[PDB]
Amino acid sequence: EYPVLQKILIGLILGAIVGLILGHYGYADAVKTYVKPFGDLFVRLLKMLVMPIVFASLVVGAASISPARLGRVGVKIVVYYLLTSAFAVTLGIIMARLFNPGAGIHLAVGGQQFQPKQAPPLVKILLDIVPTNPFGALANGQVLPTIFFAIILGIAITYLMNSENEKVRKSAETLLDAINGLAEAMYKIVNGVMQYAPIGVFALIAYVMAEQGVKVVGELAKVTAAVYVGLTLQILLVYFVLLKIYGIDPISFIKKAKDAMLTAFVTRSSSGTLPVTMRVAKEMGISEGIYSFTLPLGATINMDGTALYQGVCTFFIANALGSHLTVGQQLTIVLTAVLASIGTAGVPGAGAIMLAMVLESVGLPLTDPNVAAAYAMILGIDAILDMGCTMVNVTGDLTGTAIVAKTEG
Amino acid sequence: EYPVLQKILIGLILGAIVGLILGHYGYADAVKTYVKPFGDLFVRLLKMLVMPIVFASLVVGAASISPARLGRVGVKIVVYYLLTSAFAVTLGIIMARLFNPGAGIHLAVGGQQFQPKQAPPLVKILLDIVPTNPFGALANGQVLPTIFFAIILGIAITYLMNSENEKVRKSAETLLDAINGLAEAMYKIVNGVMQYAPIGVFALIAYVMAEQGVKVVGELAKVTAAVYVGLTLQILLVYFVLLKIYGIDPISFIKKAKDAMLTAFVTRSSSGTLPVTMRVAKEMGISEGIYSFTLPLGATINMDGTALYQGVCTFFIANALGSHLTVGQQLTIVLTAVLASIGTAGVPGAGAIMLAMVLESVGLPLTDPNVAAAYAMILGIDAILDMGCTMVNVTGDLTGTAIVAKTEG
Amino acid sequence: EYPVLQKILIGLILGAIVGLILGHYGYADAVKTYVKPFGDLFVRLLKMLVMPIVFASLVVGAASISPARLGRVGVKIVVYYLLTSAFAVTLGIIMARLFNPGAGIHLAVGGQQFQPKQAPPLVKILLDIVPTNPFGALANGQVLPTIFFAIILGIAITYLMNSENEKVRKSAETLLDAINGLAEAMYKIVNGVMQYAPIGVFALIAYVMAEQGVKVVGELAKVTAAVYVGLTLQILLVYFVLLKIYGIDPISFIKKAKDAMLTAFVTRSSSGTLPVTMRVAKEMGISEGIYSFTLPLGATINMDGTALYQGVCTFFIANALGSHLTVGQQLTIVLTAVLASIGTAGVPGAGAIMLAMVLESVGLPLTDPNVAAAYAMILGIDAILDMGCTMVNVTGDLTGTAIVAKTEG
Ligand SMILES: N[C@@H](CSCc1ccccc1)C(=O)O
Ligand SMILES: N[C@@H](CSCc1ccccc1)C(=O)O
Ligand SMILES: N[C@@H](CSCc1ccccc1)C(=O)O
Ligand code: NA
Ligand code: NA
Ligand code: NA
């Protein structure tokens, strides 16, 4: 059987070459059916775990840690997430100034038309974290509402345990252990699903490179390069540096987190790969009281690779119109991109409405057929970028978790 | 830190004055945002508990009590609920004959138009208590279906325990304890949410008295007086008298239930305040077998304060047209106001579709522009009335719970 | 109190004669209200159990059995289900050639019109078995997705138990027992609901006989005869013969499965009676490892009696038009009848969309006003056919579950 680490990489390199070739020879649709369904199963199976593994592991990751200690972990990780997202958009702007994406290109106007979905009022996202029905939250996604109830129950159960009454102490344990039993069961399934990863990894990027890899060449190549080299440069300058400054090996970090990074790459789903993102943190050594809180929160808020795309997409649309953004305007993109990660938060369709308000704040509405036709070209290679963006998105989740685990013991 | 009981009453009085004054100066919209956001947080936090706390505490509240003893409690609490709801509408009419709401007022017709929602066939309400999917019921509200499944599981789990097999006895106990563990954990969160109450109590009635307290003067003053003095008169005549007649202290009842009475007043939700209503019952001394059944059922059926509003609203609309109701018609309001509590039961939009069939069964349809304009004015102070009605609504819920617990031991 | 087996049979016979007579004297509607509601309660009480009993007992059925053993069970019971479904459509045709349903009958055209609902692509049925949200699946029917997560959790919990750490071993046990606690409790409730069976059985076929029993005479009689004599001839030739050949007493098999046969008959719902169909398997001796997996799957795929209806329905329609089907065509009905069982699988409205695609494949589309007018007559006795078809539908579910358990220990 062997790997694990290597067998995944075989299907990733084999799938890309069998993707690019089979798709360039006309048969892109022959890859949509037949090939992709296998990759979907892998995505589904990993999603299958995302709800129980988050809920069960955080209820025990709150009995684990002191309530004041969990509040400190939260204050640090949120500060980490905001600054790392601010660096990605700053690096995205500066990468889109090294590479010119669509500098001498006048776009054909009148293609696909887009409508920007309304951003829900900031108050009603912050309030909607507190779930009216904890069962409800669980029953249908709702990652952030489930987080709130797991911690609240986890703090209550830790209180209920060390009560003087021992008839109530047995109730508090049996519940806690069973919930840990579910958690433990999920991590055990992760490994099982991970054995299927090579086939899914093969099929997923066999589809992406076939259906979208043919369109990579051209003026769209200068976009993909400015995104990828930007993603490459952020790992080596903002992660590898922050890991070193906090006394943890960068080389040993990528080795252990390679499972949670490749799945994130091929799946393009931050929460989708969250069981693997969590299992990698447990084998890293981090205590449940930290990673069962930080990683699911980071799956929603720490969109590092996305903000790096949102910098080089704002500049792509700008150059295609022939309007170059001034010194004071480049900082105003940085502001709203970070505030878009909170202005969306729990709300579904983030990566689309998040960019809608980013393009709007600098003065480039998505409703304008001039902008909409140019943004349509970006979408023609969106899954090529999404792979890289999602990989960097969860790298920062794990990098922050490890740094908060270091500022602990 | 102190109170609890006093600190909440600080936010209540200070919120009412800062509400009435800030709203009268035009800035009712400035209270709608900023201030109210902190009131909702409190409501959502309470409602967060309502589902697990109702399910978990009723499973162990059926493990507690004998299967014939629980059905006896049922037959007693139901006969209590119907007579107190019948006393509320009888008092609502008699207060609406002492006070005259809109006796010399001809209304401006053509304002807001209303359409009454259809009341589901009685058969398909009664049958709908037996839920088809217990996880379904839990997952989305459904207080009454959850009651049925909890008692059916609680009676089975109690049968399962004292079986001759000590492999199946351990199974029954682990489940019963873990469920109790959830229940005991929820009551523990109740106390924590209760610490935030003074900020919520403040913000909720600071909003209501700002946005709706300015319109309390006028002919609408005679309605609010006939509602409130009716509510005060029902507490002192129907609750206090029934508390005395069954041998339990009236004053000490108010002292221990004031927490579940103030939250009911500011939230204006019967189920919304059910975690506090239950916690006040356990601290009172009532067995889990009774209050885990009666209080959630009372949060649905026993709408005492509401039937008292439904009494003086039927009379407000009748006076605003000039049509005075007869000696044979006043009894027909009493009938359908009570049979409206069952004709809605589980169905959402109760307090509105209930009044719809009440007004219709005396000869005043809500479709008629003449009636519709007059009801529109009543809606102008609907929250002001909702505060008082909900308070009495949960009071009757507690009062019944105590009387049945006395006819026990 | 007595029966159980007899008191059901008292209501079944009594309900038939009181139905047929009460219906033939006009008052069919008077049976629809009044009488049916009681029979619906019975159906609802059973369906109440179907979700917990399926999940909870299957997790402790995957902990019961070896992971390879279960795969073998699956591979056998699936091959069983296919060969029995194929026999029923073969027997349907062979009974529909013995009886001539609608041979000399020309239909009046222009009546009810039918549109056939689309069959979901086979890929997105198979893939939709792996549930994205386990809580979701539970929360809203989803028998098959639940089956998959229940076996995956049961294999994970069994691995987790005999792990070399005794802090993780207690976690896996407490959960497994609590889940079993739930399973056990459900089986207990099944006994309680079964005490209400005579009232339900009586009311349910009191309705069906009154509102459809009168229309059984005429050319529609020859249809009901060819179906029922078909159903009888399939039990006495493919079950009794397939039981005998596997060393299991047929007469004693019917004795023990009678309670899960007479509920299936009056409910008309395969999943509806699954709590009884499971308890009857438990009392039969069969290991939870097998029946908690084979019976829920059988309630979905193994629709023997149905495919015996689809046999004599594809012939009633063909006879009413005058077009007679050739030797090779009769086989093409058989093929797509069996394939339709997987073509629908999880999807609701199966028994309809299944038939729709069965008719289309031989050359008689349901859209055709000729066909539609003839099929509108068959529907006139569709509950009278459904009763018998549902019986043979679960009889084949147990028969298979017995044969598989015989190929074991
Ligand atoms: N599914 C992504 C969300 S953001 C990725 C992205 C990149 C480029 C364009 C659009 C969206 C994730 O889970 O990270
Ligand atoms: N929220 C209320 C429902 S009934 C109160 C009421 C008062 C005035 C007008 C309409 C309705 C409760 O939970 O009691
Ligand atoms: N309720 C059935 C579905 S198939 C029975 C049937 C017979 C004749 C016509 C249509 C349908 C069951 O669950 O077995
Ligand atoms: Na992320
Ligand atoms: Na109430
Ligand atoms: Na079946």
3-state secondary structure chain B: CCCCHHHHHHHHHHHHHHHHHHHHCCCCHHHHHHHHHHHHHHHHHHHHHHHHHHHHHHHHHHHCCCHHHHHHHHHHHHHHHHHHHHHHHHHHHHHHHHCCCCCCCCCCCCCCCCCCCCCCCCHHHHHHHCCCCHHHHHHCCCHHHHHHHHHHHHHHHHHHHCCCCCCHHHHHHHHHHHHHHHHHHHHHHHHHHHHHHHHHHHHHHHHHHHHCCHHHCCCHHHHHHHHHHHHHHHHHHHHHHHHHHCCCCHHHHHHHHCHHHHHHHHHCCCCCCHHHHHHHHHCCCCCHHHHHHHHHHHCCCCCHHHHHHHHHHHHHHHHCCCCCCCCCCHHHHHHHHHCHHHHHCCCCCHHHHHHHHHHHCCCCCCCCHHHHHHHHHHHCCHHHHHHHHHHHHHHHHHHHHHHHHHCCC
Closest CB from B130, B172, B178 relative to C48: B130
Ligand 3 pocket test: pick from C268, C310, C378 the residue with the most ligand atoms within 8 Å of its Cβ.
C268
- Structural domains in chain B, sorted by start: 1-409 (1.10.3860.10)
Please tell me the distance between residue A297's alpha carbon and the centre of ligand 4 in angstroms.
8
Closest among B381, B307, B379 to B344, alpha carbons compared: B307
User: Do C392 and C230 touch, CB atoms closer than 8 A?
Assistant: no
* Torsion, CA C144, CA C149, CA C152, CA C157, rounded to 10: -140
Can you tell me the distance from the alpha carbon of B115 to that of B113, in angstroms, rounded to the nearest whole number?
7
Please tell me the distance between residue A268's alpha carbon and the centre of ligand 1 in angstroms.
7
C-alpha distances out from residue A121 to A118, A308, A332, A360, Å: 9, 25, 21, 17
Closest among C85, C81, C36 to C266, alpha carbons compared: C36
Can you tell me the distance from the alpha carbon of B312 to that of B310, in angstroms, rounded to the nearest whole number?
6
Can you tell me the distance from the alpha carbon of B308 to that of B289, in angstroms, rounded to the nearest whole number?
30
Q: Is the CB of A390 under 6 A from ligand 1?
A: yes
User: Do B203 and B39 touch, CB atoms closer than 8 A?
Assistant: yes
Which atom of ligand 1 is least distant from the CA of A269?
Answer: 13
Whose C-alpha lies nearest to ligand 2, atom 4?
B351
Whose C-alpha lies nearest to ligand 2, atom 10?
B351
The residues in C 89-148 lying below 8 A from A, measured between CB atoms, are 123, 127, 130-136, 139
Closest among C37, C380, C385 to C206, alpha carbons compared: C37
Q: Is the CB of A385 under 6 A from ligand 1?
A: yes
The residues in B 180-209 lying below 8 A from A, measured between CB atoms, are 180-182, 184-186, 188-189, 192
* Partners of residue C189 in chain B, C-beta under 8 Å: 152-153, 156
Can you tell me the distance from the alpha carbon of A340 to that of A310, in angstroms, rounded to the nearest whole number?
11
* Partners of residue A59 in chain B, C-beta under 8 Å: none
Can you tell me the distance from the alpha carbon of A362 to that of A247, in angstroms, rounded to the nearest whole number?
39
**By CA distance, what is A133's nearest residue in B?**
B48
Does C170 contact A at CB distance below 8 Å? yes
Closest CB from A123, A133, A134 relative to B141: A133
- Contacts with B71 (C-beta within 8 Å, 6 or more apart), sequence order: none
C-alpha distances out from residue B33 to A346, B211, B386, Å: 21, 11, 21
**Residue A165 burial (C-beta neighbours within 10 Å; 0-12, 13-18, 19+):** exposed
Does B30 contact A at CB distance below 8 Å? no
- Tell if the CB–CB gap between C178 and A178 is shorter than 8 Å: yes
Is C344 annotated in some ligand binding site? yes
Can you tell me the distance from the alpha carbon of A150 to that of A53, in angstroms, rounded to the nearest whole number?
11
Can you tell me the distance from the alpha carbon of B314 to that of B319, in angstroms, rounded to the nearest whole number?
9
**By CA distance, what is B121's nearest residue in C?**
C33
Which atom of ligand 2 is least distant from the CA of B394?
Answer: 14
- Contacts with C121 (C-beta within 8 Å, 6 or more apart), sequence order: none
Please tell me the distance between residue A32's alpha carbon and the centre of ligand 4 in angstroms.
27
Residue B163, phi then psi, degrees to nearest 5: -85, 155
* Partners of residue C43 in chain B, C-beta under 8 Å: none
- Tell if the CB–CB gap between C149 and A37 is shorter than 8 Å: no
Does B265 contact C at CB distance below 8 Å? no
Closest among A361, A359, A378, A367 to A107, alpha carbons compared: A378
Q: Residue written as tokens 């050594």?
A: A285
Residue B104, phi then psi, degrees to nearest 5: -115, 50
Q: Indicate the SS3 state at residue C25.
A: coil
- Tell if the CB–CB gap between C170 and A188 is shorter than 8 Å: no
**Residue B240 burial (C-beta neighbours within 10 Å; 0-12, 13-18, 19+):** middle
- Contacts with C327 (C-beta within 8 Å, 6 or more apart), sequence order: none
Extract the tokens encoding C239: 């079950």
Question: How many beta carbons lie within 10 A of that of residue A124, not counting itself?
Answer: 11
Whose C-alpha lies nearest to ligand 1, atom 1?
A269
Residue A389, phi then psi, degrees to nearest 5: -60, -45
User: Do A76 and A302 touch, CB atoms closer than 8 A?
Assistant: no
Residues in chain C: 409
Ligand 3 proximal residues by C-beta, below 6 Å: C 268-270, 303, 306, 309, 351, 382, 385-386, 389-390, 393
Cβ density class B66-79: b for 16+ within 10 Å, e for less = eeeebeebbebbbe
**Residue B1 burial (C-beta neighbours within 10 Å; 0-12, 13-18, 19+):** exposed
Question: According to the entry, how was the structure determined?
Answer: X-ray
**Residue B255 burial (C-beta neighbours within 10 Å; 0-12, 13-18, 19+):** exposed
**Residue C288 burial (C-beta neighbours within 10 Å; 0-12, 13-18, 19+):** buried
Closest among B120, B119, B86 to B330, alpha carbons compared: B86
Q: Kindly report whether the peptide bond that precedes residue B4 is cis, defined as omega within 30 degrees of 0.
A: yes
What's this structure's resolution in Å?
Answer: 3.7
User: Do C301 and C270 touch, CB atoms closer than 8 A?
Assistant: no
Q: Is the CB of B224 under 6 A from ligand 2?
A: no
- SS3 letters across chain A: CCCCHHHHHHHHHHHHHHHHHHHHCCCCHHHHCCCHHHHHHHHHHHHHHHHHHHHHHHHHHHHCCCHHHHHHHHHHHHHHHHHHHHHHHHHHHHHHHHCCCCCCCCCCCCCCCCCCCCCCCHHHHHHHHCCCCHHHHHHCCCHHHHHHHHHHHHHHHHHHHCCCCHHHHHHHHHHHHHHHHHHHHHHHHHHHHHCCHHHHHHHHHHHHHHHCCCCCCCCCHHHHHHHHHHHHHHHHHHHHHHHHHCCCCHHHHHHHCCHHHHHHHHHCCCCCCHHHHHHHHHCCCCCHHHHHHHHHHHCCCCCHHHHHHHHHHHHHHHHHHCCCCCHHHHHHHHHHHHCHHHHHCCCCCHHHHHHHHHHHHHCCCCCCHHHHHHHHHHHCCHHHHHHHHHHHHHHHHHHHHHHHHHCCC
Can you tell me the distance from the alpha carbon of B226 to that of A396, in angstroms, rounded to the nearest whole number?
62
HSE of C141, CA atoms in CB hemisphere, 13 A:
8
DSSP state, residue C380: G
Ligand 1 pocket test: pick from A274, A309, A316, A386 the residue with the most ligand atoms within 8 Å of its Cβ.
A386
Question: Between A and B, how many residue pairs show a Cβ–Cβ distance under 8 A?
Answer: 80
Closest among B214, B169, B64 to B73, alpha carbons compared: B64
User: Do C62 and C158 touch, CB atoms closer than 8 A?
Assistant: yes
Residues in chain A: 409
Q: Indicate the SS3 state at residue C302.
A: coil
Q: Residue written as tokens 């098999």?
A: C253
Q: Residue written as tokens 């006076």?
A: B319
- Contacts with C169 (C-beta within 8 Å, 6 or more apart), sequence order: C160, C161, C162, C163
